[PDB]
Structures are given as C-alpha cells and as structure tokens.
Design a protein around this nucleic acid. Sequence first.
DNA 1: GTTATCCGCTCACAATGCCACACGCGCTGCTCGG
DNA 2: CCGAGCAGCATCATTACTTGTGAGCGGATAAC
Lengths: 1342, 49, 586
Amino acid sequence: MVYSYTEKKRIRKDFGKRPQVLDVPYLLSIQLDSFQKFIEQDPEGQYGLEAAFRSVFPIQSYSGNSELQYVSYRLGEPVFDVQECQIRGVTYSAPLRVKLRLVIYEREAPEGTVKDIKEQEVYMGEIPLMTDNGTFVINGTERVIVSQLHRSPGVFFDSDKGKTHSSGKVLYNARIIPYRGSWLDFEFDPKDNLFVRIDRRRKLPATIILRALNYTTEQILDLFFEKVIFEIRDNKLQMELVPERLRGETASFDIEANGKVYVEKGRRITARHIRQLEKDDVKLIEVPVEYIAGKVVAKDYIDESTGELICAANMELSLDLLAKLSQSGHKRIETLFTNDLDHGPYISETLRVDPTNDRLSALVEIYRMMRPGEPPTREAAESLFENLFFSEDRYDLSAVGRMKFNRSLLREEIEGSGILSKDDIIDVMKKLIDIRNGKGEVDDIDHLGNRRIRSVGEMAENQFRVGLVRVERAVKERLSLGDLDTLMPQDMINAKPISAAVKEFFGSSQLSQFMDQNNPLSEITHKRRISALGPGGLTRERAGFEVRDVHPTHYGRVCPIETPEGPNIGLINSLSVYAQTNEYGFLETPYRKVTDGVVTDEIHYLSAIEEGNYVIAQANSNLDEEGHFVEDLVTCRSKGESSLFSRDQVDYMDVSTQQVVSVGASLIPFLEHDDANRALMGANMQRQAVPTLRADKPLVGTGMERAVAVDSGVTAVAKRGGVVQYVDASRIVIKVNEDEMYPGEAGIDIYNLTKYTRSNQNTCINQMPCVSLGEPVERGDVLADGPSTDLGELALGQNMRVAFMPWNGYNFEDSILVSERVVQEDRFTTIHIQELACVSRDTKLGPEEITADIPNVGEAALSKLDESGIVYIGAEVTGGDILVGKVTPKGETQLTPEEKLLRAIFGEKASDVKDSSLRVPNGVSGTVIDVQVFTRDGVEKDKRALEIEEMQLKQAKKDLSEELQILEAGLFSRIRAVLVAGGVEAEKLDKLPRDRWLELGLTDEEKQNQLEQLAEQYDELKHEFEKKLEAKRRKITQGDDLAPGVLKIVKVYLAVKRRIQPGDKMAGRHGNKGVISKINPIEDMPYDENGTPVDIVLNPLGVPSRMNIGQILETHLGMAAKGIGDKINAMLKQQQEVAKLREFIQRAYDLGADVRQKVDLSTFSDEEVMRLAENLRKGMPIATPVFDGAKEAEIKELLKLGDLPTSGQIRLYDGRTGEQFERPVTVGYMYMLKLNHLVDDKMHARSTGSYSLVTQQPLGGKAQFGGQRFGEMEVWALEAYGAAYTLQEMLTVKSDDVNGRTKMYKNIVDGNHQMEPGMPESFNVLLKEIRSLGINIELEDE
Amino acid sequence: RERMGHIELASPTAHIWFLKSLPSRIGLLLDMPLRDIERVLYFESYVVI
Amino acid sequence: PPDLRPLVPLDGGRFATSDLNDLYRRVINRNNRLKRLLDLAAPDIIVRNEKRMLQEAVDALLDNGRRGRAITGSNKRPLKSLADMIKGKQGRFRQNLLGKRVDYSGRSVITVGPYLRLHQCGLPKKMALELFKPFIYGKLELRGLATTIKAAKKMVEREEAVVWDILDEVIREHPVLLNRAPTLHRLGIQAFEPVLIEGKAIQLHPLVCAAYNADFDGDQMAVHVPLTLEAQLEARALMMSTNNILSPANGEPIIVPSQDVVLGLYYMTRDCVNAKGEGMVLTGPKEAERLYRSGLASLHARVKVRITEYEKDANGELVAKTSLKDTTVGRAILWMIVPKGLPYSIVNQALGKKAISKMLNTCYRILGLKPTVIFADQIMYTGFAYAARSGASVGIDDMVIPEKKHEIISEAEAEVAEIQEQFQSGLVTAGERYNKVIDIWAAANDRVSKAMMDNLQTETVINRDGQEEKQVSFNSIYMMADSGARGSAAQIRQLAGMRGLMAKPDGSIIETPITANFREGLNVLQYFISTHGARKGLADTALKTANSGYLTRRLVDVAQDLVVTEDDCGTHEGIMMTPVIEGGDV
DNA sequence: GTTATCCGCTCACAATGCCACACGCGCTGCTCGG
DNA sequence: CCGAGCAGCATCATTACTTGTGAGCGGATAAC
Ligand SMILES: [Mg+2]
C-alpha cells in the first residue's frame, strides 16, 4: 500500500501485533546532530565555535589599550573529497578562517581608537569535518569518536556509608564540579565538623571560606542557626517559645509559662504536652538562670562606656558571664538553638576550630593552603581567590551546570549565572547541614539524570578551546611586547598549536579510534556507543564493582544487553534504539501521553527525573484499539520499581517494545524467549560477523534490517529518484526524474560503487549493484548492497539447514559439525584484503630508489616484477616473495675520489646498493589486486605511477564525457526544434548529420539569432567542461603531502580467499558460539527421508545449561519459512498459472492472528508478482519484532501451511549405518555467522629464528614468527610435578643461553638428545642492570 | 653486552633508594628526621657537622 | 652497557630513543655543565642550585618515581627508570627471568576428534613439520637422503613425501605438551603422544578438555615439545595424561565423563516398559548386541540374559559365576566393556553421571590403573556411538508447561491482591506486608515447580500387553537433567515453570516475580530484571578472575619453598582432627 | 614540663594470565651549516 | 637566507572521587 519500488522486490512477512506509532529514528542522530551543533554558525553563542570564541575573546593586552576581538568566522572548503581524502591518505580537512579586528585605544585619553586595522579571514587551523556517515577521515583511515558519559558538571551529595571510622559516622560530603576549573567540596568530620576543601588539599576548617567571602561572625551565624531571643524583662530571664523548639529531647525542669505548669517536673516532653502547650498559645516563660548552660551567644557584647568585649560572640553564655554582663545591661540577649536531632552546632564548633577570624587573614590562610611556600600578601591571595572562582576566564560552572545546580538546590531560575556566588555557596552549605540532619536526602551517582553524555561535538570544541587558551596567552604576550600599531592582524597568532591540539585530539585520543568497520551492524553499533572511560571519566582498574551495574533509570535510555564481556562491562554501553540526547546532554526517552483513558499517539521526550516523577506504563500492555487498557490493574513503573495500577492511575505509556534493547540486540530474533546472560554474547558475536561472497537474507529477521542497512553508509542509497539509465559492475548512471532537478544542470547523476577495498580489519568491502536496468527508483532507495547486505537488508551470515543431535561426539561440548556441501557452495568462504606499504626515505647517504634491478637476487625472484619493480596487477604472489623492489644506499667512508670519480659516472647508480626490498611476510599468500602509489613531487613519477594517473584520469573523464553527451543532446535538440522555425528546415535536421548545424543559413532576426545564442551556449559549455576536466586533471596528477622526507610510498594490496576449514569459529545469533570441528563428507551427514541432507549438526546439550531456548524456536520457524520457499519453488518449477501463485502467497501472508501489515498482492502487476516469487524461492523471510514475537501457535499454523509436521521434528537416517534414529530429531533453518577468528590467524609455530636484542630471548607474535610466553603459572604447574629437567632445559637451552641453544641445535641434528645448561642471558642482563646501581652483586666462589 | 661505563659526577650526590625507601636507611642510620636529610640534600638548609 | 639499552632505528633516521639513553643524556649534560661552572669562578648560588638540579636528575635516573615527575616529551607519560626495568610486571623478573618467552613450540585453537585414545592428541601437519624441523634434519642426515643442512632445508621446503613418513617415524613416540592459556592448577599443562591430522586445529581427547576446564568456544592452546632425552622421558613418566586421573586437590577422579557421553549411556541403560523384544532370553551380551544391531529389538527393553561376572575373591584369583540376570539389552550391550572386574550390579541401574563416576572409581580401586584407562576409553567410545544412535533432540513442545501453573499464579496473584487490601486498609504494617508477599510468592513458586516436575518426570503413560502403566519419562529434557548430563532441575524449573523472583542491584528482592517462563515470552520489565541479575553475575566473574589470579600468585609465592625432604621427623605433636559440627548436621 | 600514647594524615604499594591485532612514539626557537 | 639539525624544556597550572591496605610521622591527648 505504501511499499517502496525496492520493497516490492522482497516484501518481508512480519508478525507483531502492536502497531508501532513512531518509526525508528535516524540511527545516527547523535553524530550528525551534535557535529552540526558544533560546526554551524550559531548566532547565540550557547555552544559551537561561537561559544568558544566568546569565551576566549576579546583578548586584551597588558592594559595597553590594544585589544584584539572577533566578529565571526567561516569555514573553507575541502580541497580534497571523501574518496580523494580516503585514497590519497589525507585527512578530510576544512580550512578555518576567522574574522578578527585588532583595535588600539588612544592614550592617555578616554576610549576610542586611533590605531586599528581590519583583517577578515585570517587562517587558523584546519578541522576535520564529519562525513555524512557520521565518521571522520583522518589521514588515510576512517576514525570514529565514541560519545562519552560523565558526571553532569554540578553539585551533589555523597554519604560514604560507614566505610570510615567504622562506627556509623556516615559523613555526607557535598561536591561541586564545574564544566571547567578546579572543583570544590565540603566534608563532615567524623566528629561532626564541616570542612571546606579544594580538589585534594589540606582539609580546612570550613568557615574559612565564609570568612573569605567577607562575612562577619554575626552574619556568619545568622545564616545557619535560629535566634532564641531573651527579651530580659524585670525578672526571670524572659525568652520566646514555640513548643516544637522545646520538643527536642529530655527536659530538665518545669518551664512554667504565665504560671500555668505545662512541662511537668522532670523530663520527657510528650507530643500531648507539646499539643496542649500549643493549645494555650504561650509567648513567654520565666526561666532559671542556670537553664542557660551552653547557649552559645550570637551578639558580641561590650559595655556602654568601656569599649572592651565583655561577652564575646560565639564563645559561651552561662551563669558567670550572664551575671557579669548584668552589671552593665542589658535589654537584648540572643543565643543559638542547639539540639542533637536538628540544628546541630556544626557551624559553631567549626568556628571554634577556625584558626583565623579576619578576612584578609582568611585569604592569606587559603593562599598558603592552595599553594604553600610562597609570599602571603593581600593582593596575591585576593587574586588567587577571586580568580579561583568569580572568573569567567579561569572558571565556568556550565549552562547545564547552572541548571542542575539550581535544581538540586530547589532554586527557581532554571538558567542563570555560569559562575559561583556567595549565595550559592551558603545555600550549598545550608542544604548540606540539612543533609546531616534528618531533613534533605542524598542522591545516588548512578541515576542517569546525574550522568550526562557528551558527543563528539562538545568534546571537539572543548579540545579546540583548550588548544586555544595557550595561543591566547602567546598572542597576548606578543601583543604586549611587540609594536602595538605596526602590524596586520594576521601573524600575532600562531595556528600551529591550534592545529596540533585539534589533530592530536582527532588522531590520538583515548576515545578516537578507527571504526570497527568489518560489518554494517558492527559499524552502526560502534557509532552509537557510550563510554565512561577517557578524559574526565573513570578508568577500568579503579572502576569500582558498583557503577558497572544497570540502574532502573536505564530502561529505554541505554541498552542493558549489548556490552563487551571482559574487563570493561557496563562502562561500554550502547544507546537504546528510540533514545535521544537532550538539549543539555541527558538521555530522553519517548513516551506516549496517556490522557484520561485514551493512549493518544502524542509522544513526549521525557528526561530522566521527569520520568521519575511520573508513572510509566508497560509496552506489552495490550489495548482496546481505542487508547484504553483492556485490563484494569495494568503493570507499570513509577519510581524505579514495578507495580500494578488502575487504568486511570497512569500518565504515560511506552512507545514500542523495541525501545529497551540495543540496535544490535534489536537484530536478535526471538529475544524474549532467551535469557540475558547468553543474549549478551549473542549480540557481541553478531557484532563480530564477517561478510561473505554472496550474502543472503536471513530467514528469521526482526524487521530492523531496513533501518540498520540504510541508515549505515555501506549501502549506496539513491539520492534523487529517476530511471536507471545505465548500470554496470562498478558504476551506476541514474537519469533524474524530470521534476526533481534544477532548471539547468541536466545533472544525470553517477554513483561510483567502491569495489574491493581494505577495511580497518582487513575485510573486503564490495558493493554490487542490486538494481536491474530501466527500472525506476524513487528518492532514498537502495541501488547497491554494501558488504554483507542484500536488497537493502542486513545480511550477516547464511541460513543453514541444521539439526539438533549428538553425532559420535564430533559435536562434543559445543563444537559444530558441517557438511562438505557448505564448502562446495562457498557458503562461508570469505575474502581478506591486507596492505603492505614500502616506503622510500631520504637518508643522508642519499634517497631511496624503487628500481626494478636487484644486484643479488635472480630473475626468478624478479620475474614477477615489471620494468619499474612494482608487481603486475594480478600476479599470484606467495609467501617470502618480493613485491618491491627498492634498494638502499649501503656503504660510506670509502673516501677514494679516484674511485668515487669513477663511480661518479660509472657507479653513482652502482655504489652502495643494499637490497632492503619489501617482501611479503612469510606465511601469507594471496593475489595482488591493486597498487597505490604516492610520490614526492619534484621526482617526476614512475611508469606505474604515471600509468595509474592516466588511468584514473580517463575514468574521471568518462563521467564528464557522459554529461557532455547529455547536454550536447539537449542543446542540439533545441537547435533542431528551433531552426525548424523557418528555412524551412524540417527534413534536413534529421537525414543530414550534425556536420554544421551551428552554421546553417536562415533568417536573422530570431533564427540566425537563435543560432548565435545556441552557438555561444554550446561553446561556453564545451569550455566549462574543458576547465573542470583540467581541474580534475590537476587535482589528480598533483603530488601529495609527505612531510618527513619520503619519496615513493608504494602500497600494494593482497586479496586472500580464505575458505572455511576446521578450527574456524561459527556462532548463531544466540551466543551459541562454537568451533567448526570436522568437514564431514556430504553423504556421511544425516539426511531426511526425502534425500536432502542436513548441513550443520549442532549439539542439543548446550541448550538447557545455556538456557537460551530462543534459538530452538527460531530453528522451527526457520524450517517453516523454508517450507513456504520450496512450495513456491514447486509452483515455479512447472510453469504454474499466475493467479494460483498469487492467491497462495496472499494466503501465506494473511496467516498471522493480528499482524500490523496487510499486504493485498492486488495492485501488484503480474510480472511484479513473478519477480517477488523469484525472490522468495529460497524461503519466505519472516519478520518478528523483539518483544512481540510470533507466539508458537502462529508458528504451528505456519508449519501447517507448509506440508511439514507441526512438531518441527522429522525422523532421520544416518548416512553411515543407513538405519534410522529413534526419537525424531529437530531440524530447521537457523542463521549462522562466521567470526573473524578463523584459524589461519592463530595457528603458527617456531622451531628457531629471530631473537630480541636487549635479551637473547625469542620475539613474540605470529607477525614476528615468535614463540610462546611460558609464564609464571606454567612454571608453577611444571614444578608442581617433578618436571625438573623439562623446566630446566626450557629455561636455559630452549630459549636462552646463545651458546647453549646453538650447541643444542647442533647436537640434536646429529641425533643426540642432551642439554648443556649454561646461564640464562636474561640473568646476566639482570646482574648488569642491578650493577648499574651501586648495588654490588657477584657470584659466590663456591 | 658486558662492558659497563662510569661517569665522574662533578659533585657527590645521593642515592635515592637509601634516601627515600621508607624507612630512609640514611635517616635510621643517623637518627635523623628524613625531612631534614631531604631538605639538606636539596640545597635548602644547613647541616652543622 | 650499550647493548642492554639499544638504540634501534626505523625505516629512516628514526631511532627508538630508549628512556635510559635520554636520562643519561640529561644527567651527563648536567654534570658537564656543572663542572664547566666549577672551573669558571663558580658563582656560589649558581653552583648551589646546579648541584641541586643535578641531584634531581640523577635521582630521576635511578628512579623517575620519587620527589616528582620527569615525564618524557611529546608523550605525557613518565620515562622508564632503572628501577622500572626491575619492578612491576614489566621488569626483568616477572618478564624474562621467571617466565621467559619460550621459542620452540607452536600455538593454535582446539577441536575434539574423539576417535583417538586417551593418551593421544591431534596435531596439524603444518605445525608438526615446523616444530621437529631439527629432528627432521637429524633423521634425514642419518638416512643420508640429504647429507647437507642446506639440502635438508630445501627438502623440508618441498615436502617430498619422504619428509612426511620420516616425520611420522620421528615423532612415533615423541611426547608433547598441551597447555591452556591460564594454567590454574597442576593439570593446566599435560603431555600427549601426538598424531598427524589435517587442517590447523589441535584435536584432543574430550575428558582431558574437561580437565583443563577447556571449553571449545575458540579457546586457544599452546604446544611445547620437550627435546632433551631426559625431558622427554620425564614428560612420558609424569605429565602424560594417563598418569593424572586423581586431582591433586581432592583424590576424586578428575577424568569424569561430563556431557554428551553420559547422555548416551543414560539413554542406553534405561527401561521402556513395553518395547520391541521384551520377554526374550539372550545367550550372552554379544547375542543381544547382534539382536539390537539387526533391529530385531529395541535398545532398551526388559529381557533375561546369562552373564559371567568375573570376581576377584582372593588376591589374584578370578571366579566366574555364569548367572542368569534380568536386565535390558542396553545394559547387556554395555556389559561387553567392563574388564572382567566389577560385579554386574554396577551396570544394572539407570547409570547416571554420578553413577558413571562411581563405576570408574571402583574400577580404578579394584583393577589398578591400565584396565581403568582402557575402560574409560571404551566408555567414551560407546557413549558417543549410542548417543548418535539415540538422536536425543530438544524440540519446543518437549518442555511442556504444567497447565495448572496459570491457575496457581492467579491464586497467589489474588492472594497478594487481598494482601494489598490488608495494607490499603492499614490493617497490617508495610514491612510485614512485604515479607508476606515474598512468602506467598515463594510458596507459589515451590508449588509450580513441583507441578512442573510431577508433570515432567513421569509424564509418560504406556501399556504392557494390557491396560496402562506409568514409567519415568522419555522426554529429551529430563533425559539430560535426570542423567546429570547438563544443568540441573534448578534450571529446568527456571525454563518451563515460573522463573520466580529476581534481585535488585543492592540485593533486595522485587515484589512481583517473573510470572512468565522461557517457553512463554517475557514482558519487557521481566527481561529487564533478569538483566539486572545476569549483569551482576557477569561483573562478578569479570573482577573475580583477576582478583583470584593475584591471590593464587601470593599463595604460590609464600609457599614456593616447602619440599618434602626428610622421611620422618619423629615427633608426637598432632592436632586433634574431629568430625566438624556447625550447629546443624555434620 | 615531661613522657610517652595514640591518632589523623600522608604517602608508598599491590591491580590475572596469555594471546592476537591495531595504532602511535619531540620540539622549537637556538645551532649549524654552507 | 633559509633549510636542516638540535638541547635541554612544569613545555601556565598543567587539576583530576576514593581502591584498598599498611607504615610511619607530626601533633593532639593524657599520666607522672
Ligand atoms: Mg572458552
């Protein structure tokens, strides 16, 4: 009904009752949206380049009235392009030019400029843009930066439960972290004392910083404590009263008010006593003087005429001191509420501990504290403080920082200052004191609302600003020293540090990494990857066992399944499918706005905390077809929990079942019947798949294939719809539909499909054009399947006919037995493309040479080479052989001019040859398929280089030739259909050729006029085509950048066709990994009673333990699928009438109970139905959503549609015995991948060879042909047995003791087995190394 | 592989190991606070002998 | 010396400037400068500060650690001190002295190849040809077919079949060492007599792969050829697998048939009530075997067979009682393997996994060693054979859901419902309400588990020449569980019956358990909580691996010296070993 | 005051093994040098 | 003049939540 011109080719049958409301979003929302945020010209300065500028600028001089500010910026254009940058080995750069202005203000006068020069577009660094696949192209390869996940810059509260002082002294520290600058914290002493502190310095008595903020002890206490006033009346030391105040704890005496005795003699003020005391409305109490015992005083007291302190602020107030002050006054006394339940005297106790009491004294205190050993002066401490905070330059909380701060302090202004302030500090302190009290509540650090993600954009601009502050300092100082007005604002900056910073980030960072580009799914799931490591983030060693856990706020926000098993679990998560990043950097999830009783399609992108406040329904909760829950007590989740609620108790339903799992996990069929502890490894294995020769659709898919394929870059999606003018094995030429093209620009577009090209993991990527010729495609369709893709559907492995039964133990534990047929059909035989780069340096002896001639090696080792040394494209090379071909300048110090002059003319080419050729590393065979050549300009070219240059020139010329054809055709059509208007010329424009149409003679006013018009147009057309052809010519034939003296980098490519073979690693999509164990002959395999064998024989005993029943179900469905397939096959073997087949396929598609899709097969033209059938003969694909799978009843119905038994179990017959098995086995069609762990990369041995220099121990690695690391535990295992001589020789003569091992080799070849243990050379190394210190160490005489 | 060389330090100098590996062997040897020996090695103080 | 701190170049004038060279450059530069100042009139403060700087430099050279940092240029990381070249896992001690990278043998990934005997092991022809290359040259020279090492290399490079059978001869008895990557305990490294196979994989007997804790998930194993004669004879004497059947930790047999073979036997030694052939009389195990192979009778039907269970009454003797026992043709066939030792009563039962361990242990105790290894080999062979002949296969309709489970749930559900009333009406406190929900859910879980079992373990209902009988089930599931083959009922009841409760991150228990199961789907939240649990488990393993590694390292270090040297200390002080009691049973 | 006592704080010191693969590893205004 | 080598550099604040444990030291805390 809405099916694409491509979907009609193979319409996937789909289960899933829930009608999805919101389609899956563009799977690369993060990268593209965020890099747009970073790169585009933002007129707001909220973020992007403009924000970094507004921060760093306006740079000011040494108050020399010479500032240098900006107005705006712009971006240059990529001198190369993605394919050009990708093959030539250059970054996808982008020139950065900025609009600056250096103004200088007159002196000594008010503001205004008498010295100024305007400079727009001064060049500063070159940033790598984001190619439309959301990746980057650093030099040569293609790196990707994963999104980080770090604690939201702000303020929060930790408890540290009993893990110190071990006596229930949980200290509620509170830390404030900015987006930039030294953070701050407050701690509770294990004796209940506050302590302000910087990131990690000596713990200061907290109130110091309060005193640092210009606070008087009076005003100090006035901000954290009550005031129990004492309006001293004529007698009895009057005060105020609110019964909650005296509620507290045990009382000490009757506190009679007005004479009425409420508080009985003794103690234990009861809630009822409080209640009646409130009933009486008391407002005074006579009070005994001794009642005031601690009662720390607030107001500092001085007599009316002595000036001296008589009762000091915050020391004490008691009998003696009260009687003392009562000899001068008074009429006002106030003290501080004190209690162990609430209003603890923490501020007072800290002020007791407080060393200083004066503001400037406080500044010098903190000045020593932060950095000791330095002159504590007023101005220095003041600068240090008011530039530690309050400094927009050296500090900024954040925008989101300010938001999270204000919210965590129950503030109102959602957006405000990006900088701290005294009120914010005292508010943090107050809330902290409350946290110590019963009030307030701590908040975890794992709640997603506290951990924001941070894309490539923000991080990139951050590295930009960091590399920018240093050039800011430099240009400030150079503006200071140098002549103020003698220059152009074009050189005071040095962009080399900027380029260095940005290139170091994008090139060598813990986060940046070249894409896991061997599998479209792997690539996708690697772009939308969330990490917690890297700068600002925690590291895996000290990661803590807790954080790795999943937190209920993850549901729908970040996948709980996809996670690399190993050291870093939980620290490397994958974004959920429907998820999205917030406007701040938080994780929002879409929900459906549940109204009174209707579940409207209205969606809302809830944040984390917003979700927390609300109630969330369940996706699986079925509906009454009008937004109303069929049930009454529906399961739901409100605050990190799960509970039932009434239909009117909910506010938000989930959007769709899929939103919980990873995009990779989404590809797993029958997930809901599987356990997580195995689906995890399933998702990982799925990530590590490998493309094959002819990838094919997976039978049991999850419908996600369209998205994950198209939203990747691997498939060349058609941009603008049209007709397929010309297809080919490598090039596609689409004539645009007559509408969606600009007025000019006939613009018949060309898709150049990348042929076999290396991967970042040495896997061939090849796009074959899946589209026919003449068929019309619409906008955004598939025109070329990428690697391991089919018809625009992610096709990872192969659908194999598989049975679940033991087989002579050849599938003993989990090993997988196959049939030679799966090899003969090449079902898994894959390709691997690896490169070898021979470089040509320029030694002081002289630069390199790639000449074909080699002095020593024979023609046999040279026959594979050309006149230029580089091998012919296609010569089958074997291991050890020489690709090139480059000799070196060997000798020196001859200093015989009488021979030098000879060899100046006779041997300048034959003086110091040394054949440092490039040979294929021994072990790897393969066919050469390509030779890339990079030359240092000046040195002309090689014949090979020139040939490749001209070949690529001709290639690029072909497309422009086509466009010239089409424009020429249009214009000659115009000249015919216009020249006809007169003459008459209507019979000569068609039999007479195009000889001189531009010169045919007719009338002048408009006809010869039109001839003139189209003449100039045709000639300028030819001219512009010549010009752009020459432009491509230059851009192609120009030399390339090669900084460190390198002439000819010759890269050679090698393609090996690695067939499957025992030892390789195969796995289904349910973590049921295994090793292929035997290439059993075709006949020996079990076979169904209709003759058809079974390809793979798995092991059933793996299922109950691994507890992944899903795969089994899949297998059944598989057969069912294949069933339909063969049925159609029969319908196609004999030429069955169409209408029959049409009705049959229709009925097959209408088999589900209540499926979301209703294909009609009407409005399908007859040959379209036949095409569809032809693409289904190999089995009707079946789509089942993740969490709305086809209930097994529908699988039974489907199997019943085919002629296959409902039990999904078929009797067999061993090909060996010929008899049958009892217990009818289960056989179906399961999907099977092949991982790039194939044995060829592992199996290697070492008899004798190279040896390390620092120690005469053998090298390591198959690449170095090295041995094995007989490590500690192997030594222990040996010495656990006797194993004396074995371990002995293995330590001394096997792989050490050069004399000993040489003697061993020479003695064993003579047929004698005897060891000559000498001394491990590494032990001599250790002795010499210790002796490198004053530590004398010898060998004892005896 | 065996010939070791030597450098004539223009001035004497302390061996870090015996000086900082807790407990400082020099400190225990002299009954001297390690802080003092540190502050006198790095030329900041004056030890009278 | 210059050697031990080499300056290796690159393709061009790029040299790997080892940190030692740079620190030496720095310190010698300071020294030269300071001396040049000393002769040049020595401004006092300047020579003072320069002495301080030189002290700092020599300090950094001996140890970049203390007093601050001396990180290298262009790479924000410290420079390798001398001490660095000693300490840590990179210093010469833990990197080249104790465990040094050996040179002589091989590495690959493994597969099963169960045709081979217990002491054998697979070996790829390529690895073999590469390893014994010296022995190859030796046998070639001694055979004169190549009297020059150069020609020997040529021949081994051309792989003329002469080299092939020469190799076959040269390793005819030459043992070799298979080694798992993390060698936890003494078995981590073992010996085998290799045989030649194709491909690049390393076949090995299954039982010993269960010994290594060696799964076949792609786990790579290393190989090590012992070369000197003493070493070869040693490896044959001590670390050959056939000499390590009792784990040195506990004297229990380490070579136990784990899975895919126990299933075979358990299926064989079972008893279908009315199967084809019930009631006959068989003239010996070979007779019943012939009967079964010709398909004239089931593999497990009750019959009467005459058997001569040999017996060692007194030492050395062997009596033979030709009794007439009632058994099944399965057990009758399996009896053909016991080596004239054990009485028949050890084969007559269902013969589960624990029963197999019992059988092997008593065979070893009664008949020494060699008959036991032969018995184990034969057991593995016949187990695989009859497992394949069985065709045990798990289909979706096997794991039958107990139909009443639904009802049970609702009851418990209705239960908790009114309990909410008990709280919604404030008649009961919150904590007791929580505990009561937990308890009713646990009770419902036990009831549904027993329902699933009672509907599974004896689900079969058949007839013998008559009305009806109830025999233990022949379902694929519970043929793996009850046999002890793979996974216990604690997983089956998790599969078929209710999955039960699950754990919060802290360890608390969620109120509403997973009403669902695995044959039925799961609501999203259910899968989410299951994920909670599973991820907790995985993280636990991922950390405990390294922690246990470090712990066992400290262990092996603190006791690396105890070696039994004297024969009898001749003392009397002993500790009073007592049967332990803990408040419960012993 | 002495005299030792203990305690808060500081600083050093440990972090599974393998593998495999990948990537990368001075600079920068002085020095020299013609 | 201008490219190629080169000599000693915290290159300001370059910050940096714990990891868990042990030992020692400067200084509070109490007995004689
Ligand atoms: Mg494994």
